[model samples]
Target chain A: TDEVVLLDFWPSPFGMRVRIALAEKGIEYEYKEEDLRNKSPLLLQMNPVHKKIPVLIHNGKPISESLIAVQYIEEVWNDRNPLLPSDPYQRAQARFWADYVDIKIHDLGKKIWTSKGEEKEAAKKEFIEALKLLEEQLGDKTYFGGDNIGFVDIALVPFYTWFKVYETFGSLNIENECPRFVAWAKRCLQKESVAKSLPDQHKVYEFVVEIRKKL
Target chain B: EVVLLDFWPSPFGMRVRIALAEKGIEYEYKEEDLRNKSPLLLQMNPVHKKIPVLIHNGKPISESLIAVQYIEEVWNDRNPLLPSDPYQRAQARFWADYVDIKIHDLGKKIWTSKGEEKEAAKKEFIEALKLLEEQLGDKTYFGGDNIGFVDIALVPFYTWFKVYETFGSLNIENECPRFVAWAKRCLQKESVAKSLPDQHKVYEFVVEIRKKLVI
Candidate 1:
């Protein structure tokens, strides 16, 4: 009686997030790959507002926004793995950091791969500062959720798939700068869901290279 | 017991206020002088050091939307701000998030910038509201016959409408009557009425800000 479908783009960190969440919950859903230049009719129909990918279509309803979709998956599949915490206060904290990821990572990561000269230098520094802040938040916890991979983990770990692109293009060493954060990503990759959900790093890097050229 | 660390003029703080009132939750409200933040505020939200921190039984929740969600969760036995169904809930979250991400900055730009910049902001700001107006359609509220998450997320900005119109020299009512109509409809609800400040008060506050900015 339950039907789930994800419209996604390969190498999209946002799309990878939904994939990891669905995999973690052991939900079987149809996956449709979207071409950004010529988007699918379903993608356009599902998310007429943004017309972006990572749309989670459950039954006949569409849920856009990756973080919101992650929450939707958690809510509908509540019986299995708990992505968000039960305590309201803790849950709010998780939501805050996940939002922090959306605010800082995507735009800054693009700038890392795209911008030039002084702008690029500023982006690299700001991006590292953001990562270091996240590392500070991670501290001694095995995951941002303490013992298990939870909401913040799912929200953030997807970007690790594109770290190779950022590091190579920006000429930065993310691991050396934020060892604990990199370690957290490594720990998350140890999960079958995360490992399989994320595409190869070099593949993502090549995609970024072409994308940058067109830019 | 609930405690809110907030600034009176912030639309973000007003959102939490509206949510708390909708739930009929009694709490201590402490207005923070944002220019000189209280120790409790800083201690509660060290990461961002921002206002609109909701403290429940000593633990703190920063970020207004997250705090509003926290209030909804903790007081779920009564009036529900979020829809019960997961798909509908995701839709509410998405629109609320759209307001969070787009409206405030655009509104600020309308007042703060000048020349072509101000004109550009005015055009985009009206366009954004028109999009919201389209989403609103003929619904009494964004929640359809009820004051829900998106309403709470947006109604707070109604206080600043006067400021936007005056400082930006644009007639919002002329450009998007449906949006203004919806805001008026929201004000009829006691929850929204009691929570938002007077339009003139917000106007005066914004005027002071403009004066200080020397724009």
Candidate 2:
């Protein structure tokens, strides 16, 4: 009696987070790609506030924001694999890092893509520094959630597709800087949920190229 | 045993304090001389090194909203800050994040600017706040019937409303009448009233700080 639909844009790591969550739950949902230039009426009406993508429509009720939608997916489908931790402190840590990826990593990715010359160079450095810190957090853990790919992993592994984009554009080497994080990402990619959810690196890179032409 | 490292005037710090009070949790309050923050503060939250770090059993948690959620999770027995329903919890978190990122940042912009920038900040803040007001829409609290997550997330800032007005010289009441009404209603709670710093105190703090510069 319920319908699940994901309104997302290709190459949006945020959008992919929710997709990854859905895949982990083995939930069947319709996927719609958004053209940022001329957004669909449904997208606008569903998310009048942000008019952004990655809206999860549950029985026609829209849940916007990728991380929030991921949580919704986890809670609604609690019978499936739990993405968040049961421990309160652990749950808080997961939320914190996921939130950090949204604000810090994703926002810095913007600068890495758009800014010119020195500012761009500086942002790239800052971006790597942030990654290093995350790497430190990820140290020796098979996954951010320990043994299983959990919320932070799902929230972040979507961006693994974009590493190629950054490496090509920013002349950066994430592998060199954060080898543990790279290794962790590879482990995540091995999962069917992550593998099926994310677009190929080349596709995301091509998307990046197309965006640069527009940029 | 728990302790909160906070600077009294900070809205972010006040959020943790409010959450603690609502949960009936007792802890030592260490007021940081932000001018020269203590080693404990830095050591605890070496990443952000910012105020409102919650130390539970000597383990540190940083970020105000993160700490608030942690408190909600730990002290789930009484006066639930988040809703029991999954959809409702997601919605509550979304609003809280929006308030923290949009309203708090915009409010800071207004607090820190001068002349032309201050005027621009005030207008921008009001417009953003109106969006929040529309979302709030006649709810006794953001939770619909009781004071809850979004209410707690926001009410702390009400203490700074007077400082915002005097410094920015903007009439927030005229700009956000319903929000002012909501603020008054939230202030009536013992937890909120006791946890919040005095507006006069905040006003004096702002005035003293403004002698150095705005914000």
Report the lDDT tens digits of candidate 2 across residue range B1-215: 99999988888888888899888998999999988989999899887788989999998889998898888888888989899998889889888878877777777777787778878888888887788788899788887887888888888888888878987888899989999899888888888888888889988988787789624
DockQ scores of all models, one per candidate? 0.91, 0.78
Assess each prediction's global lDDT (C-alpha) against the native. Answer: 0.90, 0.87
lDDT by residue (A93-205, candidate 2, tens digit) is 88878888877788898888788799999989988988888988888889998988899998888888988888888898889888888898889989998888888989999
Query: Each model's TM-score, in the order given?
Result: 0.96, 0.96
Deviation (Å) of A186 in candidate 1: 1.4
lDDT of 1 by residue, A1-215 (tens): 78889999999999999999999999999999888999988888889989998899988789999999999999988998999999887898899999888878878988988888999999999899889889888989999988889999999998998999999989999999888888889999999999999988899988878878887
Root mean square deviation (Cα) for candidate 1: 1.6
In model 1, pairs of residues that clash are none
Q: Any idea what lDDT model 1 has? A: 0.90
Chain B TM-score for all candidates, comma-separated: 0.98, 0.94
